[PDB]
Design a protein around this nucleic acid. Structure first.
Ligand code: MG
Lengths: 59, 69
DNA sequence: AGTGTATGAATGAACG
DNA sequence: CGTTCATTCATACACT
């Protein structure tokens, strides 16, 4: 059953994408972002990797 | 229908994963690709480059997942 | 409460 | 090789 980002996670992901211009996070960034988002729910690095890859592809 | 993207079949994926996990093939040589392609060709149209990419992607994504997880 | 949509997940192909 | 791009499948949820 797939990951569904919370309100606070989506807000943080969009801030990283738009305010900090992170389009294709490095492996280092993915670990750090996942740890930050894990405060709000169960999440793994692949969820963050796909979120940015999908968001970039459909922007 | 106009895409030339190879569509692996369930049996082809089954054999590829056997080769990857049982036989420890990670970056098959040109001759290994020749033999693997000829075997998989019994189940669908497939070319050596399809096999080359499958192993390259499988190896890279195994490492990539360990990396960012 | 059936359906359409947004988007999570996957992967073949290819680039740097 | 790690990374990026392109399509396509899968489905959680909102709508009417
Ligand atoms: Mg409505």
């Amino acid at each position: 059953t797939r990951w569904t980002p919370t309100t606070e996670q989506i807000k943080i992901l969009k801030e990283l994408y738009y305010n900090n211009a992170i389009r294709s996070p490095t492996a280092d960034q993915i670990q750090k972002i996942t740890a930050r988002l894990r405060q709000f729910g169960k999440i793994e690095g692949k969820n963050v990797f796909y979120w940015f890859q999908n968001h970039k592809a459909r922007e």
